[PDB]
Amino acid sequence: MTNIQTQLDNLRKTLRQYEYEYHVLDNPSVPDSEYDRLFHQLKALELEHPEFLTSDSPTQRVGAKPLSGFSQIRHEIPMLSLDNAFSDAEFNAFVKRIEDRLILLPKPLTFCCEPKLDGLAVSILYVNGELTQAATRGDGTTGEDITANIRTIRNVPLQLLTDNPPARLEVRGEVFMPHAGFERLNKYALEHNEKTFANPRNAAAGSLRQLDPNITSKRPLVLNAYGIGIAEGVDLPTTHYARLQWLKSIGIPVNPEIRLCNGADEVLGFYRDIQNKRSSLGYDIDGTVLKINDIALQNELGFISKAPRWAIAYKFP
Amino acid sequence: MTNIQTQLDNLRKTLRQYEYEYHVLDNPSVPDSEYDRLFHQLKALELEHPEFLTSDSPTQRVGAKPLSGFSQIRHEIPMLSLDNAFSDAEFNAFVKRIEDRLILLPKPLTFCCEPKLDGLAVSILYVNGELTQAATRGDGTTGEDITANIRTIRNVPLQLLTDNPPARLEVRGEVFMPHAGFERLNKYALEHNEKTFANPRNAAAGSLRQLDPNITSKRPLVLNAYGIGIAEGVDLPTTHYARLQWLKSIGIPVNPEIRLCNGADEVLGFYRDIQNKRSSLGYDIDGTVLKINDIALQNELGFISKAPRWAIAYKFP
Ligand SMILES: CC(C)(C)c1nc(-c2ccc[nH]2)c2cc(C(N)=O)c(N)nc2n1
Ligand SMILES: CC(C)(C)c1nc(-c2ccc[nH]2)c2cc(C(N)=O)c(N)nc2n1
Ligand SMILES: Cc1ccc(Cn2cc(C(N)=O)ccc2=O)c(C)c1
Numbered sequence: 002m003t004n005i006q007t008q009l010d011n012l013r014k015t016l017r018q019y020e021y022e023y024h025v026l027d028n029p030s031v032p033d034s035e036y037d038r039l040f041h042q043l044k045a046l047e048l049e050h051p052e053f054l055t056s057d058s059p060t061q062r063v064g065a066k067p068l069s070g071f072s073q074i075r076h077e078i079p080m081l082s083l084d085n086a087f088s089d090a091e092f093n094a095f096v097k098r099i100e101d102r103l104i105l106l107p108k109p110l111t112f113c114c115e116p117k118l119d120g121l122a123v124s125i126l127y128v129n130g131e132l133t134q135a136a137t138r139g140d141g142t143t144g145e146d147i148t149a150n151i152r153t154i155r156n157v158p159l160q161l162l163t164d165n166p167p168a169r170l171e172v173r174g175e176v177f178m179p180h181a182g183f184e185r186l187n188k189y190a191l192e193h194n195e196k197t198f199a200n201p202r203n204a205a206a207g208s209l210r211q212l213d214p215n216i217t218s219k220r221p222l223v224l225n226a227y228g229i230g231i232a233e234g235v236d237l238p239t240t241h242y243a244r245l246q247w248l249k250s251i252g253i254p255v256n257p258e259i260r261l262c263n264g265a266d267e268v269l270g271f272y273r274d275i276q277n278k279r280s281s282l283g284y285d286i287d288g289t290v291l292k293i294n295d296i297a298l299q300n301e302l303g304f305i306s307k308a309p310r311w312a313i314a315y316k317f318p
Numbered sequence: 319m320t321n322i323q324t325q326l327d328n329l330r331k332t333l334r335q336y337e338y339e340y341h342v343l344d345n346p347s348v349p350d351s352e353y354d355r356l357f358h359q360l361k362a363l364e365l366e367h368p369e370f371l372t373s374d375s376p377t378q379r380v381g382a383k384p385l386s387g388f389s390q391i392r393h394e395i396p397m398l399s400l401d402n403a404f405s406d407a408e409f410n411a412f413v414k415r416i417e418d419r420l421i422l423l424p425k426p427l428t429f430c431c432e433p434k435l436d437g438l439a440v441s442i443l444y445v446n447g448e449l450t451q452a453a454t455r456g457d458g459t460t461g462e463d464i465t466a467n468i469r470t471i472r473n474v475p476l477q478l479l480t481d482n483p484p485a486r487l488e489v490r491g492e493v494f495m496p497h498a499g500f501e502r503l504n505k506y507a508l509e510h511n512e513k514t515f516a517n518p519r520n521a522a523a524g525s526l527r528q529l530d531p532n533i534t535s536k537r538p539l540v541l542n543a544y545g546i547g548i549a550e551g552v553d554l555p556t557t558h559y560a561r562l563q564w565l566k567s568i569g570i571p572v573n574p575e576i577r578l579c580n581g582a583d584e585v586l587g588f589y590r591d592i593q594n595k596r597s598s599l600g601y602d603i604d605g606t607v608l609k610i611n612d613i614a615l616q617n618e619l620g621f622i623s624k625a626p627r628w629a630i631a632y633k634f635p
């Protein structure tokens with residue numbers, strides 16, 4: 002035991018927990034000045050004693066050197082896309098198609114309804130609680146190594162907030178820029194004659210493609226997790242909402258507007274409640290993602306591959 | 319002009335037209351002995367004068383040397399997969415989902431209904447009427463070069479039967495082995511202690527994966543074209559059935575049991591007529607592929623990517 006290693010461990014613990022309280026809960030226990038006080042007290046102490054500097058410390062989010070290019074990562078589990086509806090009738094058709102396809106339809110059919118954030122899909126790997134790599138969705142099978150960029154997102158934890166983390170956990174989410182940060186970014190790009198982005202999705206997309214993480218750190222990017230990929234050394238919950246609640250409990254940011262619904266009539270209430278709220282949310286959304294809440298029924302219904310919307314193989318029994 | 323080049327051109331023309339009449343029309347004008355008479359009269363004459371031997375002659379279907387391995391071909395246009403139904407209710411749901419999604423639903427909604435052959439999907443390229451390459455579907459983006467194997471299929475023309483062929487045409491079809499040939503193949507593999515296949519789909523799949531085309535030539539494989547890929551130097555018809563009729567008119571084999579239907583009630587007649595016929599067709603089918611006949615409405619409805627069957631993005635207007 003040393004005095005310095007005791008101070009760094011205690012500071013890092015307090016700060017990672019204060020980041021969790023501000024970012025994930027929107028309920029900080031201390032003012033932003035108390036957080037910074039401990040933050041630059043830790044950073045100064047880590048430079049005075051470089052021997053005890055850790056890779057996943059909250060002071061080490063940004064890399065000092067810009068990268069040569071972007072590597073190629075292929076997704077272990079492929080990253081799935083989404084089918085889309087445009088009317089109450091079209092949504093109700095997708096629902097009847099599932100009621101008639103199920104071996105046993107339960108009473109009621111629970112759905113996990115979330116907003117369809119207008120951002121970029123990314124992967125984040127957590128090997129024994131530590132962020133080892135992050136990748137863009139790319140084509141759904143092969144993406145780019147954007148780890149340095151993903152490490153700069155203030156609400157993306159560099160370490161999971163659990164003493165028993167899984168062996169490997171791939172968090173999957175949507176990276177986006179909120180309205181306030183977007184407004185700020187254009188006004189700064191106007192007063193310094195630089196690129197202005199047409200909307201917050203292009204602003205976030207461009208910020209994540211920057212080779213220098215010192216530029217990405219200055220962009221107000223935000224992660225909201227929508228699912229899990231690799232899951233080793235853990236027994237994940239039997240429903241989608243419980244898995245999202247589980248991600249939140251170990252340090253991962255999820256959307257707060259996600260609610261459960263029983264049957265298409267309740268699910269259509271959520272679509273129109275979120276539609277009124279759209280005009281005063283603080284970030285862009287282009288609809289809602291409505292999901293079957295039970296993981297047994299997901300594996301039962303399964304997935305479609307790259308196929309037409311105008312052709313169906315009515316298979317024989 | 320030479321006497322020999324006049325005899326080869328006239329023989330090749332007669333034989334390619336007799337193959338078309340037997341294979342594509344099931345209405346030959348000459349007995350099988352008359353066809354062979356001209357065939358080995360051409361082959362003998364081509365070996366006596368090797369200078370006039372052409373690459374696409376009906377005598378040159380098989381390569382004398384087995385290949386080293388199988389190359390990797392990536393599909394220019396990707397090869398799409400299919401979504402599937404299992405009940406009258408599930409098919410009617412897919413149909414209502416399309417009626418409600420269309421900008422303008424016509425009265426009536428024509429469908430091109432075909433049997434779902436239990437074979438292997440392949441690509442065949444025709445550069446200015448000549449068969450230059452063939453590939454397996456693989457993953458739908460990348461497949462294997464099986465040109466030598468595809469050249470051995472007796473009903474696959476090595477040259478298109480038109481004096482104005484397109485610049486490039488990619489025919490897409492299902493390669494399969496009929497019942498009679500399958501029964502024959504096992505009995506021969508039993509009396510010569512060799513591999514027996516569980517069903518005609520495994521027998522065809524294995525025959526197409528053979529490196530030696532002298533082995534694939536002895537397997538009774540058959541192509542039935544289901545669609546087109548690349549189409550350069552041609553204005554293709556506005557409907558799916560007319561494109562299939564067009565393929566047949568230029569030398570390509572298509573299924574004869576394909577019929578048009580107007581509305582789900584007529585389309586379900588075809589599903590049950592083909593279901594009774596299943597037990598006496600001569601080849602394996604595992605259902606029916608029901609397609610929107612108009613190409614305008616196909617491009618309008620579009621295609622789904624690799625996505626779940628339990629998640630829908632109800633997008634905002
Ligand atoms: C169904 C599946 C595959 C778990 C999925 N996917 C996406 C998504 C975005 C890009 C590729 N996939 C998604 C994206 C969002 C989003 N944009 O907020 C969401 N709420 N849920 C999503 N769920
Ligand atoms: C809708 C689309 C993409 C034109 C298509 N695809 C297939 C198929 C088989 C394997 C991949 N795709 C197919 C396969 C068959 C078949 N097995 O007879 C068919 N009759 N039609 C098909 N149509
Ligand atoms: C100077 C400064 C420091 C920190 C923050 C925001 N913030 C606050 C906390 C906190 N309250 O526990 C934790 C993390 C964090 O990022 C701002 C806006 C400004």
Ligand SMILES: Cc1ccc(Cn2cc(C(N)=O)ccc2=O)c(C)c1
Pocket residue numbers: 336337339340341346347348349350351353354472
């Ligand atoms: C000996 C022999 C030769 C040809 C055939 C079958 N056949 C017939 C014709 C034909 N009638 O115009 C054309 C091509 C072809 O493949 C068999 C079964 C046996």
